[PDB]
């Protein structure tokens, strides 16, 4: 388990990192507290990169399935269930979280994201709920 959380924490590191290379404190998609809301945005997030292909965002979009799996194995370990996160049917909805004068939606929706990992960098070391 130390060690799927060493992983999980290097992973978020480089998508992080990834991020920069490519707003300070915008809020992420409530990127919560148990593994269960961590995996539920990190979906959400899934879900707008998809829309959205570029090569950083697919090369993020990777990642970012690598990490729900990271918070999945966790979970398994730590012998609790993560729901099957529920799926936005359409991403129409995102529009007013996403829109910014003077700013990209692919710049917000990277920039939230990059607070969602920040967010759960220093909350798996709390060894959060399920």
């Known amino acids: 388990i130390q060690k799927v959380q060493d992983d999980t924490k290097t992973l978020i590191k480089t998508i992080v990192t990834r991020i920069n290379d490519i707003l300070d404190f915008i809020p992420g998609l409530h ?10 945005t990190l979906a959400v997030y899934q879900q707008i990169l998809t829309s959205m292909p570029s ?42 979280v996403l ?9 917000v929706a990277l920039s939230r994201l990059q607070g969602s990992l920040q967010d759960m960098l220093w909350q798996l070391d709390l060894s959060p709920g399920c």
Do not use: W
């Open 55 to 96: 090569r950083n965002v697919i090369q993020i979009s990777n990642d970012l399935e690598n990490l729900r799996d990271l918070l999945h194995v966790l979970a398994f370990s730590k012998s609790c269930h993560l729901p099957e996160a529920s799926g936005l049917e359409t991403l129409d909805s995102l529009g007013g």
């Open 31 to 40: 990127p919560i507290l148990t593994l269960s809301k961590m995996d539920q």
């Open 99 to 107: 829109e910014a004068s003077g700013y990209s939606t692919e710049v």
